[PDB]
Structures are given as structure tokens and as C-alpha cells.
């Protein structure tokens, strides 16, 4: 009884079928909803077939888990770091029934950011749109415009629903310096590690994962540990994540040996990535600053770090944010955007979840990120008690 539609729809169903990161499919019968759907859905047109999809994607409660028309998969193959501006923004979905889209980090130093900001904060309207329920590319559309454009967001703090604050933005590009480092001197007796053998920490700022990061992270590690610093510090507060590679990367200028993530689904793990035995420092203690505005391969990063004993985490507990999507294309051209995994710290934590919690609790934002700022505080009476 065969349909070029059943037959389209059923590819999607497939996709997901053996692609989706939880066989449980939100607790829904998977295959009982195939039939049901080619049973009572519509698809006497491609658009219908659209639609059926769509309606069969959100069965599964997965906002990353959507249908992608041929128009956008091509809009959307590459290309958005172009002639495009938007407002120092990076926009997830919320924590349980997510419908919100929540700034997951605002970029450093980003008109955002310079106008009060902060991850965690839910993005209420863009130009008097609502945003709740809406797509992540569809809401990156009405932050983005032109240079010189503006747009007013509204955004509340998470919790505070009425406590709406009002942005009225200027369009800017704004790229994000991946990596900022210093030697602290005359470093306080409270932030020194135990056995310092010189009043010097080494401090590294890194913002994001990226392309550059790679090469500005060896030069940092590079540079600090010829400095002969007593101690590391690491500060991947509000670091949203990014290249995933470049996480593997850094973790392993510190970790010589050992697993540093897993990747895993429903039915256990897919891959893992260890250490390759080389190292810049693995010796140096080492202290990770995070907060919630650390995530995805930031927080891989942070798994590594700790579950290899490699370092101390400080801070708080980070974003909770470890699904890998991808996008499945369909034969007429249109895609299925699907999470298909999970990322997990070598010790079997579930990141999404969780998330990685500091050993060290500290008050996370006891640190400026500007360096002559950082030092003081590091040398201050006051300073913090890093390890």
C-alpha cells in the first residue's frame, strides 16, 4: 500500500528510528506511532508529510530534535560569521520541559554582556516577538540584522519571572578572544596550593572553543610553565562550549594518561577519547574556575580535569549541558536535526544531567577576568582560597 509521502515520512521516522540519543523515545512507542501516524496523518502533499513529521518530532520533548525543510538545510550548511551581525549572545533551551530559550553566556565583552546580560537569563521577547516554544535558529534570526542595527530583547533573571529587564541593543560583530594569560606575582599565601615554592600563579582565561583556541591554549601552557609558576589556574567560567576537538585539545596539554570523555546513548558508549601522552603540564597544580555559565565542551574539559585528578574543580556547579546533535538528510533534500548523543566524564557522569560540581565550592565570581585585575585580587589579604 506504498506512498511517496509514507515513504518520506517514514525515512524521518527511521532517522530518529536509529539515530535518537534515548530509545525510549520520550516513552512513547516509537513504532506504535508510525502506524498511528500513516494511519491517521495526512500527507497528501509534501507539506502535509511536513507537518506530520514536525508533529511526530515533538513527541519526544527534545527541542534540538526538529525538522528541517530543504530551505533552511541549506540556509543553513555553513555560514552565519559573515556580513551577519547579532549582540554578543549565545541562546539554549531551558532545564526541564525547556520550552525557553535562555542566554546560555553572553560573549565577553559583547554588547549584550556591556548591557547587563548574564547567562541564565531568559530571553522573553526580540522586537516584541515572544520567543517561548520557538526555534534556536529562528530566534538567532531576530537577534541578527545588520551592522549598526539595533533590536530590543527583554530578558529576566532565572526565577524572576517579573523581574524583566530590557535591552535595547546595537548590532555589533563581535568575536571572542578564545585566551588570555598571565603570571600573578606576590600571589597571596591563601590562593598559593600547598607546597608552593613561590608566590606565582599562572592564570589562564578561557572564553570559548574555536578554532584559534588551540594554539593560544599551547601558547599559554607553554609560556607558564617555562615561567617555573607555582600553580594553574584555569577560568572557564561562562565558556559555553564550542569546538568539541579543542576541548580533547587542551585536555590534553594537562592530562598525560587516562580516558577524558565518553560518548555514549541510550545503549551505552559509542566512543571515547584519553589522553596521548603528551602533555605540556601535568605536573603543575592546577585549579579550574567554573560557574554555571560553563558548558558542553567546557564541561567535558572539566570532566577531564577531575576525573583524571588532574585538577581541582572551584566554583559552581556548571550548565548541565551535554547532548550531541546532528543533522539526517532526507532524500528530497529536507534534514531531521537529531540529538544522537551524550557526553559523559571518564568516571561515568552523565554531564546533561548533572553537570560537573566543584570539589573546591567556592564563590565563583570572587575573580575578575582582566588581567591586572585578576593578580590583585590574587595578591589581595583577601584573596581566594583557590585550593
Given at each position: 500500500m506504498v506512498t511517496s509521502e509514507q515513504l518520506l515520512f517514514l525515512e524521518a521516522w527511521r532517522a530518529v528510528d536509529r539515530?535518537?540519543?534515548?530509545?525510549?523515545?520520550?516513552?512513547?512507542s516509537w513504532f506504535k506511532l508510525r502506524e498511528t501516524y500513516l494511519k491517521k496523518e495526512p500527507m497528501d502533499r509534501r507539506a502535509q508529510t511536513y507537518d506530520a513529521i514536525r508533529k511526530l518530532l515533538a513527541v519526544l520533548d527534545d527541542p534540538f530534535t526538529?525538522?528541517?525543510?530543504?530551505?533552511?538545510?541549506?540556509?543553513?550548511?555553513?555560514?552565519?560569521?559573515?556580513?551577519?551581525?547579532?549582540?554578543?549572545?549565545?541562546?539554549?533551551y531551558d532545564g526541564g520541559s525547556g520550552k525557553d530559550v535562555v542566554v546560555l553566556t553572553p560573549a565577553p565583552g559583547g554588547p549584550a554582556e556591556k548591557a547587563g546580560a548574564r547567562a541564565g537569563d531568559v530571553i522573553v521577547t526580540v522586537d516584541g516577538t515572544a520567543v517561548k516554544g520557538l526555534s534556536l535558529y529562528d530566534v538567532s534570526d531576530l537577534?541578527?540584522?545588520?551592522?549598526?542595527?539595533?533590536?530590543?530583547?527583554?530578558?529576566?533573571?532565572?526565577?524572576?519571572?517579573?523581574?524583566?529587564?530590557?535591552?535595547?541593543?546595537?548590532?555589533?560583530?563581535?568575536?571572542?578572544?578564545?585566551?588570555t594569560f598571565t603570571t600573578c606575582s606576590n600571589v597571596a599565601?591563601?590562593?598559593?596550593?600547598?607546597?608552593?615554592?613561590?608566590?606565582?600563579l599562572g592564570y589562564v582565561?578561557?572564553?570559548?572553543?574555536?578554532?584559534?583556541?588551540?594554539?593560544?591554549?599551547?601558547?599559554?601552557?607553554?609560556?607558564?610553565?617555562?615561567?617555573?609558576?607555582?600553580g594553574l589556574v584555569l577560568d572557564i567560567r561562562n565558556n559555553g562550549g564550542g569546538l568539541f576537538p579543542a576541548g580533547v585539545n587542551v585536555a590534553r596539554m594537562l592530562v598525560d594518561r587516562g580516558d577524558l570523555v565518553l560518548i555514549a546513548?541510550?545503549?551505552?558508549?559509542?566512543?571515547?577519547?584519553?589522553?596521548?601522552?603528551?602533555?605540556?603540564?601535568?605536573?603543575?597544580?592546577?585549579?579550574?574556575?567554573?560557574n554555571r555559565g560553563t558548558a558542553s565542551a567546557s564541561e567535558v574539559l572539566a570532566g577531564?580535569?577531575?576525573?583524571?585528578?588532574?585538577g581541582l574543580?572551584?566554583?559552581?556547579?556548571?550548565?548541565?549541558?551535554?547532548?550531541?546533535?546532528?543533522?539526517?538528510?532526507?532524500?528530497?533534500?529536507s534534514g531531521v536535526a537529531v540529538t544522537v548523543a551524550r557526553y559523559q566524564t571518564p568516571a561515568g557522569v552523565d554531564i546533561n544531567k548533572i553537570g560537573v560540581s566543584p570539589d573546591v565550592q567556592l564563590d565563583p565570581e570572587v575573580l575578575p577576568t582582566d588581567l591586572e585585575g585578576v593578580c590583585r585580587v590574587l595578591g589581595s589579604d583577601a584573596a581566594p582560597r583557590l585550593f
Amino acid at each position: 500500500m506504498v506512498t511517496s509521502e509514507q515513504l518520506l515520512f517514514l525515512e524521518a521516522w527511521r532517522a530518529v528510528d536509529r539515530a535518537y540519543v534515548d530509545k525510549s523515545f520520550n516513552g512513547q512507542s516509537w513504532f506504535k506511532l508510525r502506524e498511528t501516524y500513516l494511519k491517521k496523518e495526512p500527507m497528501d502533499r509534501r507539506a502535509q508529510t511536513y507537518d506530520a513529521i514536525r508533529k511526530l518530532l515533538a513527541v519526544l520533548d527534545d527541542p534540538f530534535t526538529r525538522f528541517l525543510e530543504p530551505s533552511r538545510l541549506a540556509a543553513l550548511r555553513r555560514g552565519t560569521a559573515g556580513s551577519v551581525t547579532g549582540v554578543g549572545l549565545e541562546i539554549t533551551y531551558d532545564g526541564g520541559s525547556g520550552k525557553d530559550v535562555v542566554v546560555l553566556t553572553p560573549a565577553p565583552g559583547g554588547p549584550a554582556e556591556k548591557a547587563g546580560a548574564r547567562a541564565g537569563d531568559v530571553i522573553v521577547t526580540v522586537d516584541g516577538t515572544a520567543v517561548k516554544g520557538l526555534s534556536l535558529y529562528d530566534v538567532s534570526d531576530l537577534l541578527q540584522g545588520e551592522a549598526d542595527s539595533q533590536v530590543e530583547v527583554v530578558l529576566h533573571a532565572p526565577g524572576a519571572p517579573s523581574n524583566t529587564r530590557t535591552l535595547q541593543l546595537t548590532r555589533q560583530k563581535v568575536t571572542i578572544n578564545p585566551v588570555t594569560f598571565t603570571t600573578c606575582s606576590n600571589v597571596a599565601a591563601a590562593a598559593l596550593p600547598p607546597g608552593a615554592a613561590k608566590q606565582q600563579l599562572g592564570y589562564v582565561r578561557l572564553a570559548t572553543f574555536n578554532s584559534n583556541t588551540t594554539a593560544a591554549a599551547q601558547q599559554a601552557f607553554t609560556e607558564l610553565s617555562k615561567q617555573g609558576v607555582a600553580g594553574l589556574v584555569l577560568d572557564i567560567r561562562n565558556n559555553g562550549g564550542g569546538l568539541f576537538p579543542a576541548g580533547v585539545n587542551v585536555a590534553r596539554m594537562l592530562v598525560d594518561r587516562g580516558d577524558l570523555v565518553l560518548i555514549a546513548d541510550s545503549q551505552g558508549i559509542r566512543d571515547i577519547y584519553s589522553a596521548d601522552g603528551n602533555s605540556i603540564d601535568s605536573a603543575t597544580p592546577l585549579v579550574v574556575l567554573v560557574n554555571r555559565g560553563t558548558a558542553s565542551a567546557s564541561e567535558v574539559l572539566a570532566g577531564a580535569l577531575k576525573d583524571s585528578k588532574r585538577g581541582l574543580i572551584a566554583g559552581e556547579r556548571t550548565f548541565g549541558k551535554g547532548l550531541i546533535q546532528t543533522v539526517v538528510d532526507l532524500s528530497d533534500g529536507s534534514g531531521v536535526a537529531v540529538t544522537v548523543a551524550r557526553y559523559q566524564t571518564p568516571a561515568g557522569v552523565d554531564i546533561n544531567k548533572i553537570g560537573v560540581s566543584p570539589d573546591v565550592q567556592l564563590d565563583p565570581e570572587v575573580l575578575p577576568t582582566d588581567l591586572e585585575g585578576v593578580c590583585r585580587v590574587l595578591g589581595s589579604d583577601a584573596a581566594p582560597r583557590l585550593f
